[PDB]
Design a protein around this ligand. Structure first.
Ligand SMILES: Nc1nc2c(ncn2[C@@H]2O[C@H](COP(=O)(O)OP(=O)(O)OP(=O)(O)O)[C@@H](O)[C@H]2O)c(=O)[nH]1
Ligand SMILES: [Mg+2]
Lengths: 117, 181
């Protein structure tokens, strides 16, 4: 029954964002944590970004995968899995070539993400 | 209000976070703090001048060195905490701590802190170190580190006795407010 350590001192990043380390509580809905992170990086439009582990996963933090936020695991905020999916419709089907190739290596790396899937 | 990013560096099990939690939160951590790194803020006065401290409790691990070296930028004073009970932590300050804080911040002032000055005389620490073939860091030894690695001052603290804690961090601040010559 009892919850794990919710108060967790984790790094929170966004590609290009210098991490700021707080005592994040995991109980509140992830919309609020993403909200505070995004406002910290001056980001509105919270639903279009989802945190992700800076682990080798690159897997986006939804409610399914935030019990993997352990002390010291860097959080790397980035586009939410739906936004990554739309990005991929436009940069996987398009007529650009290098963009398709790199975006498709991204899509291959990201297919393992059930949250993105 | 003037802030100083005082990234407190120093090995594991030597007393960074003990000194900080005795300073920012005024408690002596019972057990070796599992540290990645933290952000605090207190209200301290330095030789009659009150100052703001936004502090950083960096890790002593070899593992998250990339994150701790991300912390070194924006730092204005480097507090290196090494155990007097464990002068191998002093040797690590000589090999990695001061060198890495300087490679990430050259000429940015460094305080040198000898944690556990209360153990230079405690029987357990002396007997343990003599059984380890080393002696607790004498103030001359830490001062030799300070002269060698250009520390602004070599202080000593005892978070167990709450010794020098506020003094340690005020000196860290005045390493920047009043640059040492
Ligand atoms: N007796 C005594 N022990 C101390 C003192 N300061 C630290 N310690 C011991 O050091 C251990 C670890 O505390 P810290 O020195 O803060 O650990 P740290 O330097 O922050 O290193 P990390 O937390 O791993 O990043 C504690 O369990 C204490 O037993 C002190 O002033 N007196
Ligand atoms: Mg520490």
């Amino acid at each position: 029954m009892p919850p794990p350590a919710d108060i967790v001192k984790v790094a929170i990043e966004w590609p290009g964002a210098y991490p700021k380390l707080m005592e994040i509580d995991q109980k509140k809905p992830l919309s609020a944590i993403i909200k505070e992170v995004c406002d910290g990086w001056s980001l509105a439009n919270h639903e279009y970004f989802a945190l992700q582990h800076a682990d080798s996963s690159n897997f986006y933090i939804t409610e399914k995968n935030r019990n993997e936020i352990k002390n010291g695991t860097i959080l790397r905020l980035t586009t939410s899995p739906a936004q990554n999916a739309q990005q991929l419709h436009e940069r996987i089907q398009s007529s650009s070539m290098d963009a398709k190739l790199e975006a498709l290596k991204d899509l291959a790396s990201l297919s393992r993400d059930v949250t993105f899937a | 209000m003037q802030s100083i990013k005082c990234v407190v560096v120093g090995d594991g099990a030597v007393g960074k976070t003990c000194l900080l939690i005795c300073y920012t939160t005024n408690a002596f951590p019972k057990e070796y703090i599992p540290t990645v790194f933290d952000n605090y803020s207190a209200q301290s006065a330095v030789d009659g001048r009150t100052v703001n401290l936004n502090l950083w409790d960096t890790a002593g691990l070899e593992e998250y060195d990339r994150l701790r070296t991300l912390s070194y930028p924006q730092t204005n004073v480097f507090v290196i905490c090494f155990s007097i009970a464990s002068p191998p932590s002093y040797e690590n300050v000589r090999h990695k701590w001061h060198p890495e804080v300087c490679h990430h911040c050259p000429d940015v002032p460094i305080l040198l802190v000898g944690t556990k000055k209360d153990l230079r005389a405690q029987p357990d620490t002396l007997r343990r170190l003599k059984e380890q073939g080393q002696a607790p860091i004498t103030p001359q030894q830490g001062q030799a580190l300070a002269k060698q690695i250009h520390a602004v001052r070599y202080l000593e603290c005892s978070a167990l006795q709450q010794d020098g804690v506020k003094e340690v961090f005020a000196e860290a601040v005045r390493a920047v407010l009043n640059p040492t010559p």
